[model samples]
Target: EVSQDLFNQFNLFAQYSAAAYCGKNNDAPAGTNITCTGNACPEVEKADATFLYSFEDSGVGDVTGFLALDNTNKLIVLSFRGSRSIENWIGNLNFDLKEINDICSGCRGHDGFTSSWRSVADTLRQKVEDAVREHPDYRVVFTGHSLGGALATVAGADLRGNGYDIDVFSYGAPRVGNRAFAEFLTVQTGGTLYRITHTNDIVPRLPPREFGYSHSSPEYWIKSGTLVPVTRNDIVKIEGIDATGGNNQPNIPDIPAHLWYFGLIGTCL
Candidate 1:
């Protein structure tokens, strides 16, 4: 059963994912504090999170995201924005698999997604390390939606491989890696990774299992729509990859389901 505290945490990360979209327009330079007023990131205005840095790679993969310090939650939040550019859309369509030797010997991941994270990895790692040095006890949490979710998965795995314990909350994220990579993330996160999916959300079923891509463990499926309050019973917790139940049930791909995670996600305002 999903506890109330856990439910609230997921909702909060969902807001962070939504706020990441705002980075596209705000274009705040690295190290500038984020202002939540004026539709910039009203979703997390009350979160008491201090924005630290924004990273992007428009020339290579069109990846964009931000890092923030949430003293209230004792967390270093890393949020990635979903695809908003033609380049990003094109990158997402590339299904080539690439071996990630750093994570695990046989681990493999989506080539495009891996490249997206690698594009901004150096700057992101430096900022995160600096934040950790100042607040040694704070935990790191990674999050995003769609393409952003894929990026979060890659980023979390990479950081975890470097010995930093982290949590990942990916909304409607597609398959990121092979079984070896999936199991590697499962062990690294130690049950803190939450691969969330809404009813019939099309994105989670992407890259197809036939392509050798798999998701990490502990999927939380929201069985109901956004209008209704989510209860413990409203969520179904499926351990590992369930090919028969949860969001894996055979159905037509639904884009609308992917857009409504807890609320209207992927919005700047």
Candidate 2:
């Protein structure tokens, strides 16, 4: 369940019914002002400003959300969660979203994590800029559920150089970048960027370390060092995957799906 304030802030009650639902795996907290007691987190150095997410009829992008802040730690602007689907992702959903991932594999062309970062950063940048002009005293905390989380990770990394106190929280987001890239993103965000995965959320486990190379030659070399080259079978592992661009996994929603907010969920990413 969401916070009452969120229901008011997003006008969710007026906009969509309970039937039009969205969820994140291991979304630990079950209610608004959601409590995640005893969890280790960063200092929240900057103001948490504006949060913006809307699913419009224009058909531009169905699901998109962002956070815009004024300073570092301030009254957070609440906007994060999509009510609709992204046009580009209409027919593509679930772990099988690998088709789209394959298309996005082009990020491998850049060894410095450019495309992997901006697939959604550019949009958030615009909202942040607008929010700052309106409320210069707040900072931004971008968040999302599932794929939205992956986008949040990419956007959070892109905002590192801008000096905006950006904290990205993604729930159930798959591995969006190489290990070095992921670590680099965390460092670039000054530890403000985080990826939280539920215990049984298999989405993050899809693309194995073998796919790390296609993203960067150096990244690939790094992966090669990690995998135990036991035998020809070790190399044969690649045969199961098709990362010519990217690999897609079966996004089947199982019975008693993990999509629900369980009692032992990992609330924050």
Candidate 3:
């Protein structure tokens, strides 16, 4: 079960994920300030997170996201935006797995998601490193929704491989890699990765297990549809790839479930 403190922490990252969709266009270069004028802005502002920079690559994978400094919480928040363009959608449909030996021996990941992370990897690394240098006490967090969640997973794993103690919080993210990669990520994060899913959110089920894809451990499944007044009873904490419980329970896809994590996600303004 998720403790009230942990639940509140995840909710805070969820706001950062929602803010990722609101700011500048995909072409925005690194160091661009986040406007933070969307629906999640109020909560984001309340968190005392000051936008530090934005990064995107419209040509390859069209990945867009931002980094911020949450002084009040002593966090360096990195968030990616969900699919919003044809390129992102196309990237989602490409389910081929590619070998990623750099992360671990025989580890493989979704070709599309890997490429998306690669596009912004260099710049993101430099910027994050720079932030860490400035605030050594701050913790790093990676978060996103849907396609963005997939990117965050890969990014978090890649960075963890580079020796950063980070936490990953992804909402409605699909299967990112094969079983080997999943195990590697779980161990790399030391179980800090929180792969969250709402009831019957189809995005978490895709690039299906039939295609050799799998999720990492410790899933936080929100069992109810209602957004407000959530309690520990409304959540089920499943460990080690629950195949029969939580969100893994067989049911028809509820598209709306994908959009209502905390509040309407993937929305700008």
Candidate 4:
């Protein structure tokens, strides 16, 4: 069970993170609306993401949102907090709802990279379960702009593991992690995690060249926006369609939302 204080704190994190990153007034709760630690959002959202040597200094902006049935069409989408980065820290985090700490844990980091947003997945899974009352017919969709897209990927993975149907639609999302990690994601997800990527966003080329990570590099390239991030992670690109499909095959949306699908086994963006 979550302490009443912590549940509220997570809510605060969600609300303020979204407000500062998006900068929409009155869109979120009071007190937490403008709490960016740096007092400003970075330019990465619109421009190519900038590089920061300090892990403490590297962060994406935040916003508060949730996962639920659209009610309009019964679509269950996980709403993200848009752009976020470390320099801004989404202002100050002050939650006020119910039990809190249970809702959020410290960030998970490995080697020189950061993410370990699994706690985020836990929270969303709870909400999704509540929304569906554990119904077997429902699926979860993740929608976010910029960094929010990455978070959706993390959550989508966990949700898929839990047997919840999942889809991800991200606008200008950066490379989630290294090539191996990216492929591991698709291998683990099978076909449930779907990524909708905006190829021109350029944020995908982040973490810089010095970090042994690059956008043009397979491990760093965006996959069907999620898994297939490696030219060799699963399917080598040259194999040709069926030679090896990289993008989401059955999962690919046939709308304007569809941009490029990797060979269903290789990287696309």
Candidate 5:
């Protein structure tokens, strides 16, 4: 169900979203071009896409991200910021992923998600509500890397549950919930969610699988050209899966794979 052209186009925006989390240009207008000026910020050049809005969550301790529109591509991109500070890292550590019965009945999720990401979604709800109200025609894609990816999952599910047709393409996100949550979401969203992981990215392996946390499936795995040398430039492998998002291969460093994805698509965060 995924195409090369479609995946390439959206994956570029995913990289853009990841770089935007470097968190510069807070005052940049909606139609302005995005270019972050900090260390590790990629050269964000999307001539077709214009930055539309941004979210700042100091209350949850440094959660930041942006929204952008690529009318030429007919896409509204929702990108979340990955872990940046101590508090943000703390969120990654708070692994008690449980049922989100309060937010969505019959849905289970990460308790860390409940306390951290759920609040961020609540705040952004009004902004997204307004955006959807104004331009209901554009297809929305949610994304992020690491912690941001986890939040993006929650955000995507929240909007989808509220009746918006949305897609999620999270990068290296940790497990968000239990089997019930994964099953309910898979059936509810109907294959619109994708958790993309590079070979041996450790972040995707935790809150530690033994903690009763699990990922929703249909995972897209990216191969690393380390051992055998990948031939083609675009090497993404999609895995059709059940509720459990498979297991990690042994002894791989989680570090390199997480950042490698954006680079392959010509953007670096």
Candidate 6:
């Protein structure tokens, strides 16, 4: 049920989130990539989308969120920014995935939750719940990259379990949990879970599979060179692999692949 058209559209939405980390669309000047009101994202502004709100949990990390609503399409878009906190980057070394209660039923091991990620989810969950109440008929779409991508996985799984329908696209995300969590989440989402990766992107291989942390399937693979990114024409479709290039080594830095998608770079720097 993973539609190609759906993937193509959400990709731009995910790309827009890169700017969500930089400037707020509310007060941003014209011609900036982050604006949601006017002179908004070139792609989103043309899509009849409105800037709903922007959220940041500065207490936790530079964890940020951007919400956009498409009235005509009845779609609610939630985009999370990747790690902007040096604190979170430091926390990435705590690679042990632990069990979290009340996330997923009958899936304890799959409940491998990172404390840093959960912090953002718990803080942002209330805002998400509030928005859903006002737009009961809208379809929720969650997208993020890197740490934000991991947060999307956590938030998406929790939201879906709470009776609101959701679809997620996480790019360059490390494995969120083990087999039980991935299987349980995919089943609950009913084929809406997509973990997108680029070739040799080392972030996806982190918290290593050796630690029992593994990625979920239906992964969308984008082809790339060793140092620079490739256009969509070089992308490929793949399913069920831990690391790009089918290599599981976790130390290499394929950051360019992580930053560029569909010829766009969403920066944290």
- Output the number of the lDDT-best candidate: 3
Clashing pairs in 3: none
Which structure is stronger by lDDT: 2 or 5?
5
* lDDT value, candidate 2, whole model: 0.34
Q: What is the C-alpha local distance difference test score of each model?
A: 0.76, 0.34, 0.77, 0.36, 0.62, 0.62
TM-score winner: 3
- Arranged by lDDT, best first: 3, 1, 5, 6, 4, 2
Q: Model 1: per-residue lDDT, tens digit, 113-135?
A: 88877877777778888987888
* RMSD vs true structure, all candidates: 2.8, 13.4, 2.7, 15.8, 4.1, 4.6
Tens digits of lDDT, candidate 4, 1-269: 32444233222222222322333321433222122223232211222221111011113323344433333234444556443343232232111112112222321212211333543445446656665564455545565444555566655554565555665554334444433444444445423333333222234334332343322122212333432322323222222111112221223222222222221111111
Could you tell me the TM-score of candidate 3? 0.89
Query: Model 5 segments beyond 4 Å from truth?
Result: 26-29, 36-44, 85-92, 103-107, 226-247, 264-269
Q: Over the stretch 1-269, how does candidate 2's per-residue lDDT look in tens digits? A: 33444323222111111111222211222112211232211122122322233332212334333232323335333234433433333234322111223323323322222343444445546756676566655555556544455554555555556655765544444555454454355345332543433333444443445566211111100011111221211111112122231112334322111232211122222
The Cα error of candidate 5 at residue 196, in Å, is: 0.5
Segments in model 1 whose C-alpha atoms lie over 4 Å from true places: 23-26, 30-43, 85-92, 161-163, 189-191, 226-229
Q: After superposition, how far is residue 170 of candidate 5 from its true place, in Å?
A: 0.5
| Candidate 2 lDDT score at position 54 | 34
TM-score list, all predictions? 0.88, 0.47, 0.89, 0.46, 0.80, 0.77
TM-score of 5: 0.80
Rank all candidate structures by their TM-score, best first, as comma-separated numbers: 3, 1, 5, 6, 2, 4
Task: Report the error of model 4 at residue 160, Å.
Answer: 2.6
Residue 177 lDDT in candidate 4: 42
- Candidate 1 clashes between residue pairs 3 or more apart in a chain or in different chains: none
